[PDB]
């Protein structure tokens, strides 16, 4: 019966297989290069590279968050006392007065002598929190009669083009500093040689990440979400002011308590997991928004003084924005230290594979080099159209940054892109290994990938990185094509 059915079945039913060649791999997402579209805006919850933390030398032990922000503003009082608003840039649908009144209410509330960090439920706080904006539920019998009521057409994400602030975020978040931010607790004593190898490996692996920028940005997200979730359940009906805290240690070993800004908690009677609590962020910065205005259409910027940053004077700005989070995303923020393991495992695999080849701990060799071997070098990025060799440390941080950006911009566009693009990745590896790969409906692969490139910065920049990487592989394929033959 099988063979008798296959005889009478139409020839049109087939897989239409075609062997994959490199010119069949057209760059993914043709619309991201089109200038007719608007460039993708910064949409993270907090600032990352542009942040500016007000330092404060302390004993190095926990204090109350209000008292910390008070003593930080005590040190840098020139900015705290600035009640004169110098507005630089303004979000389309924002209210200069309300926002600045809010900032002053936060500053003064935190600066006061009393315990509570609660904020008065004002008319400007009710706008920035979005009070009463929920719609009223009514009976089905009424809505059926009311002919003005209709099913809303759904909001579809906008089609954004490539923006260079992502590239610069990546470039800067991956670089080293002099400030360690991680809060890694203690462990048991080492006994077995494996534990002494691991402990010795951590000195190279961990401090490579700890000293870089992305480590402090991550710890900022974690500790903030940790307290932002606590207020969201403890003080539900109460509007509260929460500081953007993070303790830091410099290379000399002195505990600096950093304050990157102040945030307003909304009304948080969060029943379902996806229920939203709107949060309003007031964050310090050194970046002039007029430089990259396409980056900040969601932000409202003031100018509230100046500081001696790197010896010279630098203008301090206040980036104000109405934002939002939910129970889920606050939890995933508390579980965001795991961005270490995903990048530390990936590179310890390369250290263990290299130790297999040469039969001794190749950690120091990979990072620094040694008597026998040179340091491990990777293709790290481009520079005026040619490759650049970065060290093992940099390749470690680049993955750690990529793992942090997977969270900070984590949504359905990322999942759909990563998954469907990973297929087109594997095919390229088969072409690199010359395993004669065949495809059945390549337009289906592209249609499945390209629908996920809308308005996620990390997706749009990864699609650009993917096409630059795909371009450089095509120049290497000119080596293998004429081998032997």
């Amino acid at each position: 019966a099988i063979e008798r059915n296959l005889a009478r079945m139409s020839p049109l039913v087939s897989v239409t297989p075609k062997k994959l060649t490199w010119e069949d791999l057209r760059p993914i997402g043709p619309h991201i290069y089109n200038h007719e579209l608007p460039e993708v805006p910064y949409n993270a919850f907090l600032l990352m590279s542009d942040e500016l933390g007000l330092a404060n030398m302390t004993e190095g032990k926990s204090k109350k968050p209000k008292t910390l922000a008070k003593e930080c503003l005590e040190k840098y009082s020139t900015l705290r006392d600035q009640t004169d608003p110098i507005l630089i840039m303004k979000s389309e649908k924002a209210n200069e007065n309300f926002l600045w009144k809010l900032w002053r209410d936060c500053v003064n509330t935190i600066s006061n002598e009393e315990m509570s960090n609660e904020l008065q439920k004002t008319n400007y706080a009710k706008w920035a929190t979005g009070d009463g904006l929920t719609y009223q539920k009514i009976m089905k019998e009424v809505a059926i009669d009311d002919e003005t009521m209709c099913q809303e057409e759904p909001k579809i994400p906008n089609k954004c083009r490539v923006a260079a602030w992502v590239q610069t975020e990546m470039n800067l978040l991956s670089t080293l500093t002099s400030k360690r931010a991680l809060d890694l607790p203690e462990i048991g004593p080492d006994v077995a040689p494996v534990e002494h190898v691991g402990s010795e490996r951590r000195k190279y692996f961990v401090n490579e990440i700890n000293y870089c920028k992305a480590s402090t940005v991550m710890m900022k997200y974690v500790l903030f979400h940790t307290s932002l979730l606590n207020e969201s359940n403890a003080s539900m009906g109460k509007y509260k002011v929460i500081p953007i805290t993070n303790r830091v240690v410099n290379e000399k070993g002195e505990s600096f308590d950093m304050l990157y800004g102040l945030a307003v908690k909304g009304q948080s009677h969060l029943r379902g997991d996806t229920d939203v609590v709107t949060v309003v962020t007031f964050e310090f910065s050194s970046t002039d928004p007029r430089v990259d205005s396409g980056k900040w259409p969601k932000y409202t910027v003031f100018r509230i003084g100046s500081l001696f940053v790197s010896g010279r004077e630098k203008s301090v700005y206040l980036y104000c924005r109405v934002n939002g989070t939910n129970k889920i995303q606050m939890k995933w923020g508390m579980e965001a230290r795991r961005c270490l393991l995903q990048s530390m495992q990936q590179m310890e695999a390369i250290v263990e594979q290299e130790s297999s080849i040469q039969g001794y701990d190749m950690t120091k060799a990979c990072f620094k080099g040694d008597r026998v071997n040179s340091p491990k070098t990777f293709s790290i990025g481009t520079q005026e159209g040619k490759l650049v060799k970065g060290s093992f440390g940099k390749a470690l941080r680049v993955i750690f940054t990529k793992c942090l950006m997977h969270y900070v911009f984590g949504n359905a566009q990322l999942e759909g892109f990563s998954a469907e693009s990973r297929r087109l990745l594997l095919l390229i590896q088969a072409l690199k290994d010359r395993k004669g790969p065949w495809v059945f409906d390549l337009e289906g692969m592209y249609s499945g990938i390209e629908e996920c490139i809308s308005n996620n910065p990390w997706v749009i920049q990864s699609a650009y990185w993917f096409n630059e990487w795909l371009g450089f592989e095509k120049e290497g394929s000119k080596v293998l094509e004429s081998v032997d033959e």
Binding site: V194, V197, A234, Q353, S356, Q358
Partner: protein, 730 residues
């Protein structure tokens, strides 16, 4: 307490709801109404716990006097609230209530705690009393096998374990007595005495008992050690690229040494065979081999287990050699007679052809099965005599059955009914003889009837027995129940006796390379030599790359100086001995092409140089054996392709990167300039060169059978790797 139960029963029966519940609901349905509740399944407990910990009173409390000893507040901190919980109907409390109870709560009775949770405490002493060894970096093959996770007190099935737990904790509610009670009466007596005075809840004891009785067997990547007290430390023992020598504390089993002892001796022999003077390597290694803590000398001396491989080493070191076989449950020892296995097809009783290895020649053994003992005399498919002793019925029955099956009698083969090709519980086909063992142990009525009977011995000390293991005048044919209860070794590892005969064959050990039970160790330089295929493949090629400077230089000078190096003997122990010379003669000839002619390929030189150790073997013509792939022992993966890359060996000429069993190596800076457009046909077949490119007139891609039969100076087409036609001449 009985009065309190009946009083609570009367007060409960006042409620017309409870009374109807108690009268209408069955004892079966108890299992339903117990799980009835308003509780919902938490789909995101990671989130819900972080949320619940930010609230005031997330925890629930049991209603009792101990709950009331917690105060409502403590120094301003709200410990608990008046509002009850829905499920418990006790006061809800905060996480601070726990910390208060641990600090200022009532000090309870913890006597018996160490005996209740003994199972866990035995892990602590197995780590505390242990001693660690060396950490070594280098490849490891990991074989994914079902293994026991934690060591047990006495292994049982769940049904058997539950009844034992039931007899310990709730004897009045055990129900029907089982045979397990009589078997494990001392384990019950022990656990009953140990767990008497404790105040901990029975349901906890039943959980801890079920942990140390029922087995947790799960698949895991393992190498070397497979014992439960090693598996529990598996995370620290090994990785994909590193090893850690570990010696756990406490006592270890005798059977566990027997398992590793065999694999150790076999692995010693498999290596020393290829190198001349095998006895020298076998003694050099075996002296410095260790099984966990004991050396191999001590284990072979103290344990009376062994097998073919085991004895051969016992001779090479010293002291006696025990020729003992194990047929499932029957344990034998060789008195006299050396039989020989021969594969034949026997048409067994049920009506099916079966390939079985028959043991020719006469043999005599000292037999023992559990408690019953005896002496066995057999020949080629015949039970000549079977002088056994009187013992328990199941031991006397199974000894006679196992002697009937081990003797390979035709009365046994022609006594099968139905089917006997059943798999085990996991789904693996058992071997011909063990299948008959599993069958006739259960269904013996076909064997006893087809056997036949005869007169019993009329000597006073001798007696006969019938089918039901009782004394009888008509005994089984050949069965009798009686009342009474130097060597040297060759260069090539065969044991000779004073009269010239040979009793142990070097070519008589099993090729099956299984995993050991304890930590196998080689306290020597060059451990890798006693390694798995890929371990030796990867190490060998690393020793090549490490000395590629001098080996490539000396290949232009020293003709056959390199082909034999210390390192390549280990690589040869991988190769099937029936192809070692064929590969060597081919690899040497292809290498000699690149030497004497002006066509070098360093990636190929590295690939074939290890295959050239074993003395070569050419064809009758003088030309070597041509090959597509050079297969190796174990697994279909392990082979080195000549033209293409392969799971073990491939080369990426774009990056000049060599892949050796996954690991990456760089050849950049060690390649000649003319290797850009240098086709591979000039190092694929020995005595062949590329003239032009694929000519359709020559025809199809000619196979090895054609290529070897082609005459010298004759063109032909060859396909290197998929999509690379080449035109080659001899």
């Amino acid at each position: 307490m009985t009065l309190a139960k009946i009083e609570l029963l009367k007060q409960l029966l006042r409620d017309n709801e409870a009374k109807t519940v108690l009268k209408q609901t069955t004892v079966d349905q108890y299992n339903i109404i117990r799980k009835f509740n308003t509780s919902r399944i938490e789909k995101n407990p990671s989130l819900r716990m972080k949320w619940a910990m930010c609230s005031n009173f997330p925890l629930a409390l049991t209603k009792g006097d101990m709950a009331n000893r917690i105060p409502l507040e403590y120094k301003g901190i709200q410990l608990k609230t008046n509002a009850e919980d829905i499920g418990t109907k006790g006061q809800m409390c905060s996480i601070a209530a726990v910390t208060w109870w641990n600090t200022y709560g009532p000090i309870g009775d913890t006597e018996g705690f160490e005996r209740v949770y003994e199972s866990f405490f035995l892990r602590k002493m197995r780590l505390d009393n242990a001693t660690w060894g060396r950490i070594t970096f280098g490849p490891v093959e990991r074989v994914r096998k079902r293994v026991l996770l934690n060591p047990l007190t006495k292994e049982m099935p769940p049904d058997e374990a539950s009844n034992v737990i039931m007899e310990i904790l709730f004897p009045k509610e055990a129900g029907i007595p089982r045979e397990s009670t009589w078997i494990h009466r001392e384990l019950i007596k022990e656990k009953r005495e140990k767990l008497k005075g404790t105040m901990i809840t029975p349901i906890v004891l039943a959980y801890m008992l079920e942990r140390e009785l029922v087995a947790r067997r799960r698949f895991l990547p393992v190498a070397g050690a497979t014992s439960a007290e090693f598996i529990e430390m598996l995370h620290c023992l090994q990785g994909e690229n590193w090893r850690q020598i570990y010696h756990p504390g406490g006592n270890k089993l005798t059977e566990s040494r027997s398992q590793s002892m065999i694999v150790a001796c076999r692995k010693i022999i498999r290596r020393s065979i290829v190198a001349s003077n095998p006895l020298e390597l076998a003694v050099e290694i075996a002296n410095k081999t260790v099984i966990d803590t004991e050396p191999l000398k001590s284990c072979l001396a103290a344990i009376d287990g062994g097998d073919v491989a085991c004895d051969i080493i016992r001779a090479a070191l010293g002291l006696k050699i025990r020729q003992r076989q194990r047929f499932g449950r029957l344990e034998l020892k060789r008195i006299s007679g050396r039989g020989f296995k021969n594969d034949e097809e026997i048409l067994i009783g049920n009506g099916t052809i079966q390939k079985i290895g028959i043991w020719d020649g006469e043999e005599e053994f000292h037999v023992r099965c559990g408690e019953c003992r005896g002496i066995l005399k057999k020949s080629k498919m015949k039970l000549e005599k079977l002088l056994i002793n009187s013992a328990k019925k199941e031991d006397m029955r199974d000894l006679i059955i196992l002697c009937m099956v081990f003797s390979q009698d035709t009365r046994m083969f022609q006594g099968v009914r139905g089917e006997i090709n059943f798999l085990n519980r996991a789904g693996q086909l058992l071997s011909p003889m063990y299948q008959l063992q599993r069958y006739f142990l259960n269904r013996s009525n076909d064997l006893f009837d087809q056997w036949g009977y005869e007169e019993s011995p009329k000597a006073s000390e001798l007696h006969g027995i019938n089918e039901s293991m009782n004394a009888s005048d008509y005994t089984l044919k050949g069965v009798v129940v009686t009342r009474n209860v130097k060597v040297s070794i060759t260069k090539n590892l065969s044991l000779i006796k004073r009269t010239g005969e040979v009793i142990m064959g070097a070519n008589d050990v099993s090729e099956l390379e299984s995993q050991a039970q304890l930590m196998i160790t080689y306290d020597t330089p060059k451990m890798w030599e006693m390694g798995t295929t890929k371990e030796l493949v990867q190490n060998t090629y690393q020793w090549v790359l490490k000395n590629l400077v001098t080996l490539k230089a000396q290949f232009l000078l020293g003709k056959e100086d390199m082909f034999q190096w210390d390192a390549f003997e280990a690589f040869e122990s991988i190769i099937p001995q029936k192809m070692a010379g064929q590969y060597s003669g081919f690899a040497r000839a292809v290498l000699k092409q690149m030497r004497d002619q002006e066509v070098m390929k360093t990636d190929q030189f590295i690939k074939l140089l290890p295959f050239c150790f074993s003395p070569p073997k050419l064809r009758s013509n003088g030309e070597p054996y041509q090959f597509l792939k050079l297969v190796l022992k174990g697994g279909g993966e392990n082979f080195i392709e000549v033209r293409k890359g392969s799971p073990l060996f491939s080369y990426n000429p774009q990056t000049e990167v060599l892949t050796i069993c996954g690991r990456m190596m760089s050849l950049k800076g060690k390649i000649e300039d003319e290797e850009r457009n240098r086709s591979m046909g000039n190092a694929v077949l020995a005595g062949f060169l590329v003239s032009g490119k694929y000519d359709p007139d020559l025809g199809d891609f000619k196979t090895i059978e054609e290529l070897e039969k082609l005459k010298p100076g004759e063109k032909a087409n060859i396909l290197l790797y998929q999509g690379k036609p080449v035109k080659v001449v001899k």
